[PDB]
Amino acid sequence: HWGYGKHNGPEHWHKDFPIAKGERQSPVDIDTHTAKYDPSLKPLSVSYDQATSLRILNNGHAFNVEFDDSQDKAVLKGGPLDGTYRLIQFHFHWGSLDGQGSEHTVDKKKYAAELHLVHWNTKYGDFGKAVQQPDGLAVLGIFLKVGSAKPGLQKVVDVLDSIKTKGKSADFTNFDPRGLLPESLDYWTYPGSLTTPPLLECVTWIVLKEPISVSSEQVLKFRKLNFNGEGEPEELMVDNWRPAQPLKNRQIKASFK
Ligand SMILES: NS(=O)(=O)c1ccc(O)c(NC(=O)NCCCCO)c1
Numbered sequence: 001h002w003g004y005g006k007h008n009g010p011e012h013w014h015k016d017f018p019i020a021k022g023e024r025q026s027p028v029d030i031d032t033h034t035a036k037y038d039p040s041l042k043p044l045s046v047s048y049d050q051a052t053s054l055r056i057l058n059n060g061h062a063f064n065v066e067f068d069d070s071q072d073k074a075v076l077k078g079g080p081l082d083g084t085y086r087l088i089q090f091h092f093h094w095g096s097l098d099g100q101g102s103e104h105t106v107d108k109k110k111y112a113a114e115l116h117l118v119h120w121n122t123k124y125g126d127f128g129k130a131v132q133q134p135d136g137l138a139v140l141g142i143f144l145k146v147g148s149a150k151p152g153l154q155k156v157v158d159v160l161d162s163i164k165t166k167g168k169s170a171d172f173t174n175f176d177p178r179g180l181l182p183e184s185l186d187y188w189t190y191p192g193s194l195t196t197p198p199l200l201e202c203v204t205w206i207v208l209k210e211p212i213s214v215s216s217e218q219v220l221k222f223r224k225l226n227f228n229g230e231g232e233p234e235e236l237m238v239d240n241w242r243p244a245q246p247l248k249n250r251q252i253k254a255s256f257k
């Protein structure tokens with residue numbers, strides 16, 4: 001099965017998922033001088049006031065905080081998107097060291113981690129249909145740098161002891177994802193893919209310019225999770241990021257100068 005090790009990591013994925021070598025793969029390096037400011041880009045509309053978090057799950061590759069997506073409760077609109085996209089889950093990718101962990105890079109700079117708020121286009125009816133469409137998902141990507149703590153992340157950090165190993169889940173209600181957002185919603189955007197298998201080319205990526213700061217203790221607690229299931233040999237869940245992929249025939253657009 002695929003993963004992030006020496007024998008099943010990102011350089012192996014194409015053998016089971018040939019789209020790994022496709023034309024719109026993610027993540028990418030964001031060359032800030034080559035991105036083009038698009039003044040027609042609209043401000044992002046993040047409407048998370050009615051969000052209903054349900055549960056947090058260790059799936060063996062990351063942890064997902066899952067939301068009720070059966071109504072328009074937490075939606076992303078505007079920006080480059082047409083229509084309404086519903087929040088289904090968020091998760092992170094992170095490193096073994098503070099100098100690495102993000103999937104996207106900014107002028108080759110790697111951040112300590114990257115948050116992915118995953119949304120699907122309501123015109124396709126459900127997430128499974130949406131991932132089969134070139135405009136099916138919108139993933140809002142937010143970089144994490146190590147510095148001051150992020151208070152809105154702490155409820156996530158504190159529950160991780162309950163989901164240490166693959167397949168463990170915990171109730172996780174009343175979590176407000178607005179506590180994970182930076183001040184500015186300035187963003188870069190480009191067409192891309194899921195960054196884990198099945199690597200489907202269904203994502204409008206929206207990557208925020210401004211990182212959030214989290215404390216060293218917060219990211220340390222991410223690194224105590226396990227890729228393995230309970231009663232299996234312990235592999236720390238670290239470096240669960242795919243490196244930057246070729247940009248090919250794509251232009252990254254910026255909502256700001
Ligand atoms: N990193 S991402 O581009 O924001 C991303 C957003 C939504 C996704 O569905 C995936 N891929 C995925 O879930 N693959 C199957 C493993 C889960 C079952 O345990 C990746």
Ligand SMILES: [Zn+2]
Binds near residue numbers: 091092093116195
């Ligand atoms: Zn992700």
